[PDB]
């Protein structure tokens, strides 16, 4: 609150929308978010990135990719190199989303390589972290997330670390009758800030933006953003509907 940290609301569209559908959504969004009091990012699928970035030129809407590889080029069929995003002037890249850690063998080692590559290619990484139902139930939330942060941010300079955007995903709450409370979210996010401080020092911790990446809807965002350590939101399904995403942006 006392510390200056520009809030950031990023929409993770996940696997949704053709090129024309993607452009139609950002066209709808433009007049609804022109007065945002936060940074605004939309993250379309790879095949839509060029069209979406070109469509939002002249506005405050930034664009993120949903993943990338860490090498410059090479024998990685199906993968997208950081330089391919950089050539499109993409602003952000999501790294370590729970869905990629679960289904596609994303490891902490590859996350770390990707975060470093982001900085080498004028991309700001949105590093996702978070614990499972079983890890939370066993009381290991902070140990698990500390292990992710330690490994994923290894080797960064202070100047790089303070530019990372960290998104906390409460995987434990995915698919249940109750979402994390704003207090639960804030407590774990404050812990993450403490992990950053221990690694990079107090000034870096004071500056790093940390988003909540559990369920975010128009009716939850005001309470979430009022919390002491929450700097924004990595929004899932609500990001797919222009009016709903704009409500979250205009919290």
Nearer to a copy of itself, 18 or 202 (CB): 18
Tell me 109's DSSP state.
Answer: H
Question: Least CB distance from residue 23 to a copy of itself, whole Å?
Answer: 12
50 touches a copy of itself by CB under 8 A: yes
Q: Which of 38, 40, 55, 84 is in the footprint of a copy of itself by CB under 8 A?
A: 84
Alpha-carbon dihedral 18, 24, 30, 32, rounded to 10 degrees: -110
Nearer to a copy of itself, 12 or 224 (CB): 12
Q: 130 to 189, contacts with a copy of itself by CB under 8 A?
A: none
| Phi/psi of residue 83, nearest 5 degrees | -65, -25
Size of the site for a copy of itself (CB under 8 A): 41
In this structure, are residues 30 and 42 in contact, taking their beta carbons and an 8 Å threshold?
Answer: no
Q: Closest Cα to residue 232, out of 120, 102, 92, 56? A: 92
Ligand-binding annotation for 237, yes or no, is yes
Question: Least CB distance from residue 92 to a copy of itself, whole Å?
Answer: 13
Q: Closest Cα to residue 129, out of 151, 156, 160, 103? A: 151
Catalytic residue among 97, 106, 121, 131: 97
Element (DSSP H or E) covering residue 189: helix 182-200
Q: Closest Cα to residue 63, out of 37, 44, 86, 79? A: 44
Binding site for a copy of itself (CB under 8 A): 12, 14-20, 45-51, 66-67, 69, 71, 73-81, 83-85, 87-88, 94, 97, 99-100, 103-105, 236
Binding residue ranges for substrate: 12-14, 175, 215, 236-237
Q: Annotated catalytic sites, by residue?
A: 97, 169
């Amino acid at each position: 609150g006392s510390h200056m940290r520009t809030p950031i609301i990023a929409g993770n569209w996940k696997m949704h929308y053709t090129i024309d559908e993607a452009v139609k959504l950002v066209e709808e969004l433009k007049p609804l978010v022109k007065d945002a009091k936060c940074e605004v990012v939309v993250c379309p699928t790879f095949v839509c990135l060029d069209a979406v970035k070109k469509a939002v030129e002249g506005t405050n809407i930034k664009v993120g990719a949903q993943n990338m590889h860490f090498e410059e080029k090479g024998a990685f069929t199906g993968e997208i190199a950081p330089r391919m995003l950089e050539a499109m002037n993409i602003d952000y890249v999501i790294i370590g989303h729970s869905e990629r850690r679960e289904y596609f063998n994303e490891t902490d080692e590859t996350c770390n390589k990707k975060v470093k590559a982001a900085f080498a290619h004028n991309l700001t990484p949105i590093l996702c972290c978070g614990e499972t139902l079983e890890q939370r139930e066993n009381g290991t939330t902070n140990d698990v997330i500390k292990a992710q942060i330690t490994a994923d941010l290894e080797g960064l300079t202070k100047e790089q670390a303070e530019k990372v955007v960290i998104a906390y995903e409460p995987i434990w709450a995915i698919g249940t009758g109750k979402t994390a409370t704003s207090d639960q979210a804030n407590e774990t996010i404050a812990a993450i800030r403490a992990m950053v401080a221990e690694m990079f020092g107090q000034e870096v911790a004071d500056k790093v933006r940390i988003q909540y990446g559990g369920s975010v809807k128009p009716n939850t965002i005001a309470e979430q953003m009022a919390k002491s350590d929450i700097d924004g939101a990595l929004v899932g399904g609500a990001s797919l509907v222009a009016a709903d995403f704009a409500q979250i942006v205009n919290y």
